[PDB]
Design brief:
GO molecular function: RNA binding; translation factor activity, RNA binding; translation initiation factor activity; tRNA binding
Order of helices and strands: EEEEEH
Strand order of the largest sheet: 3-2-1-4-5
Protein name: Eukaryotic translation initiation factor 1A, X-chromosomal
Main location: cytoplasm
Largest sheet: 5 strands, antiparallel
Strand content: 25-35%
Number of strands: 5
Family: Belongs to the eIF-1A family.
GO biological process, one term: ribosome assembly
RNA sequence: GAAGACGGUCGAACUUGACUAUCUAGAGGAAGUAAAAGUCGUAACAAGGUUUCCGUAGGUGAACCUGCGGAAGGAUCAUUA
């Protein structure tokens, strides 16, 4: 509904391996692998898929854990990409809902 | 009557070896437990769709199946001269 951007302690990541036990692996836009955690509103109200644009929170004393906040589906994700936040090597690969 | 010496006894300890109680690393690999969403299939609970279970043996990705002998914790307390 609204375009909210990243802040201090938050960034964007791409889901690489979709696991169980309410956690997943996401590749952050800084160049490090992290074990993210599914938020309490993100278990069943929304469904997180692979290769999607998500909001990932930083951890200030350990640097191998994270947690996920939001999810951008198609148009706000491509509008955020048009603004410029990521290295251009990463590929969207047309992330949206299929038919 | 001192130092010293042979022999005997008690005897700490040393060197060559074995046994030995506990702790700390260890490639390799099989296990158990706690995690809201991974994959395959549906074994069990209603006759769960092949009734379940026990002992033994073989089989197969996985739950699992089959042969032999028992149990009712069975869906039968009973089927007529």
């Amino acid at each position: 509904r609204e375009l909210v951007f990243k802040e201090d302690g938050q960034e964007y990541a791409q889901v690489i391996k979709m696991l169980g036990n309410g956690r997943l692996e996401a590749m952050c836009f800084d160049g490090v692998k992290r074990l993210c955690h599914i938020r309490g509103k993100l278990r069943k109200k929304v469904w997180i898929n692979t290769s999607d644009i998500i909001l990932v929170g930083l951890r200030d004393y350990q640097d191998n854990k994270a947690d996920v906040i939001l999810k951008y589906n198609a148009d706000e994700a491509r509008s955020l990409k048009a603004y410029g936040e990521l290295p251009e090597h990463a590929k969207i690969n047309e992330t949206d809902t299929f038919g």
